[PDB]
Amino acid sequence: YLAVIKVVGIGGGGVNAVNRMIEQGLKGVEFIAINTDAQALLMSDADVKLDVGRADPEVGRKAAEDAKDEIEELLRGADMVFVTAGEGGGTGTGGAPVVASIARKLGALTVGVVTRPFSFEGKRRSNQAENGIAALRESCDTLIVIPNDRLLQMAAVSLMDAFRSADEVLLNGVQGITDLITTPGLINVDFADVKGIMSGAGTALMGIGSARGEGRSLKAAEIAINSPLLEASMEGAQGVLMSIAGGSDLGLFEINEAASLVQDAAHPDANIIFGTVIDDSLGDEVRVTVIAAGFDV
Amino acid sequence: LAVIKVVGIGGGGVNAVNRMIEQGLKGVEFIAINTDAQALLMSDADVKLDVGRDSTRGLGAGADPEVGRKAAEDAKDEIEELLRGADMVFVTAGEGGGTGTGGAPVVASIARKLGALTVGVVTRPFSFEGKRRSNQAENGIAALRESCDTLIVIPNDRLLQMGDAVSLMDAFRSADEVLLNGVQGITDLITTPGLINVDFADVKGIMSGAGTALMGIGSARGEGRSLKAAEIAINSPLLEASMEGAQGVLMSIAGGSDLGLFEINEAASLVQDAAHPDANIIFGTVIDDSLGDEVRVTVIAAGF
Ligand SMILES: Nc1nc2c(ncn2[C@@H]2O[C@H](COP(=O)(O)OP(=O)(O)OP(O)(O)=S)[C@@H](O)[C@H]2O)c(=O)[nH]1
Numbered sequence A: 001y002l003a004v005i006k007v008v009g010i011g012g013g014g015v016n017a018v019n020r021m022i023e024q025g026l027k028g029v030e031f032i033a034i035n036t037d038a039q040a041l042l043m044s045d046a047d048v049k050l051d052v053g054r055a056d057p058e059v060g061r062k063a064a065e066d067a068k069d070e071i072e073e074l075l076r077g078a079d080m081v082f083v084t085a086g087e088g089g090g091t092g093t094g095g096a097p098v099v100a101s102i103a104r105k106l107g108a109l110t111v112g113v114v115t116r117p118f119s120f121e122g123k124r125r126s127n128q129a130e131n132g133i134a135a136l137r138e139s140c141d142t143l144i145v146i147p148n149d150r151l152l153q154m155a156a157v158s159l160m161d162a163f164r165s166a167d168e169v170l171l172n173g174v175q176g177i178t179d180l181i182t183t184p185g186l187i188n189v190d191f192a193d194v195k196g197i198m199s200g201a202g203t204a205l206m207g208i209g210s211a212r213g214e215g216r217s218l219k220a221a222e223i224a225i226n227s228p229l230l231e232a233s234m235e236g237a238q239g240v241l242m243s244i245a246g247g248s249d250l251g252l253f254e255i256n257e258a259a260s261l262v263q264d265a266a267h268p269d270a271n272i273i274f275g276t277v278i279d280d281s282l283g284d285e286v287r288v289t290v291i292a293a294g295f296d297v
Numbered sequence B: 001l002a003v004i005k006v007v008g009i010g011g012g013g014v015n016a017v018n019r020m021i022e023q024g025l026k027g028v029e030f031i032a033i034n035t036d037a038q039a040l041l042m043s044d045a046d047v048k049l050d051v052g053r054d055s056t057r058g059l060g061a062g063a064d065p066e067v068g069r070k071a072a073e074d075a076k077d078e079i080e081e082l083l084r085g086a087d088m089v090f091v092t093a094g095e096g097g098g099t100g101t102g103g104a105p106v107v108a109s110i111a112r113k114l115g116a117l118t119v120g121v122v123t124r125p126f127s128f129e130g131k132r133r134s135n136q137a138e139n140g141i142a143a144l145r146e147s148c149d150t151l152i153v154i155p156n157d158r159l160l161q162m163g164d165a166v167s168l169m170d171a172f173r174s175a176d177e178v179l180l181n182g183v184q185g186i187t188d189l190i191t192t193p194g195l196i197n198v199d200f201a202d203v204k205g206i207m208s209g210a211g212t213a214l215m216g217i218g219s220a221r222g223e224g225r226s227l228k229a230a231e232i233a234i235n236s237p238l239l240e241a242s243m244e245g246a247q248g249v250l251m252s253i254a255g256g257s258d259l260g261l262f263e264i265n266e267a268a269s270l271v272q273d274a275a276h277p278d279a280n281i282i283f284g285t286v287i288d289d290s291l292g293d294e295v296r297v298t299v300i301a302a303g304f
């Protein structure tokens, strides 16, 4: 009866992202690692693991289609599937859309998570990364797109910091939503609400914010609604999800001030899903995640 | 904090990493890369990558370094994605086989292309392993040295002059230990500093572009421990009697919190008296409450 959430990392970048989620204690989900390369295997502590290798996206797609039945049996039962090939290119890019289409034909709410690489990484031809997004958005209910370039606006970031930041915000692209659904807080939500703003919703962007001390929830919320990762698209989004993670001492009044701000910041006709998550490991810090989907005609 | 990643590649490198994990080396991420799937399933590394499955069946590179080089290069995008974010990468291997000899330069070059401070720590095989393993290790060391800021070379032959005079497995365990000593002697300055704090920036200043290097290790307890451990270390057979001509020297003294500045300083006086007249010498200390009344000096010598 409660939502069954499965999180699928496919390809080297995807299995590695899933391994990071496991090491950071992301709870309440089933982890699935799918390897798509014949020549190598990244190992994983995921609950469920499937090797389909039997650096090219076409290779990753054929490997996944060859295993469509096995893949489908792993996904059967899920209310929600996340699919990511994480950072980097590779076969995962090709296999991701196959997993996503299987999940959506199964009727799971299917959320793709994809990263645009930094511009300083170059491009390898076919417009490979752009095609990978398009194929994924062709088969996802919601595609969360993380533009890594916008991280360089979040300061005077070093090259190592830029990579560590990309990893962290990718992880949050899953955690911020899944914790809202799976983990109790003062303000809880219905999986059905979440299904309503994300189903058939198309492309989404994300924003994050953190603060300590006085007015932490309003500060963190204002950082999140203003995140360069949202690419100034908050005002036109027709679906908006916001989750506030903090300690269990966080007062209703302060929470509500953040909820009121996202409503002022959002388009008047937007669906807004608002909740909180008790995470006492955070001290007097509070962490806001904002997912914006849709667009205004 | 600086993000430190330690890569064991090939069988010996993966075994050294397990020993690092067994002995509690902290503050680093351990990455095991091998061409044998069952040896990687016995690894306790945080991250594990099986390469060359098409070209080796998961049974090693058959002592062929070109096989190990192609297997790592085939996985270069994956490896790069595992290293991304590190300020410091160590690349550790037993030279002379196929996987470590061939693959270590690829891992190192990725770390260097990312701009991480890239430190190799590798062993020369024992003379009794035969002349092809020595030849292959020679080429592998030369390739590795092109892609490392500092490449620490540990001659296994000299291990047999130290400690107890037994068993083949015992000797390789000794290799595992000295590889750990070379990694820990450096990483602990950054992750668990004592009184004389030598941070990542300092280590980067002395180790960047430094070239080939040797190490010495020494420990002692009781009266005059810090002087004793320092003298064993600067006289270590692993230093191949070349300490005294080295112009860059990094030295760490690890001890419990009862280790006094006076003790530390007396060891430092001894080392710089014995050093090259023009040598750059950096001394740092490591708080390690696990050592009891023991003190442990590690010495890294480059620039001969
Ligand atoms: N530290 C350490 N060194 C080892 C161990 N076993 C072998 N060595 C050393 O490392 C060298 C390389 O061995 P090994 O690492 O196992 O080969 P490999 O790189 O995996 O190459 P392969 O795939 O062709 S079998 C050996 O020649 C020996 O000198 C070990 O258990 N610990």
Ligand SMILES: O=c1cc(O)c2ccccc2o1
Pocket: A015, A033, A034, A035, A041, A042, A043, A044, A045, A049, A050, A051, A052
């Ligand atoms: O550690 C493992 C073992 C495997 O069988 C596997 C298969 C596919 C994907 C990831 C995997 O990680």
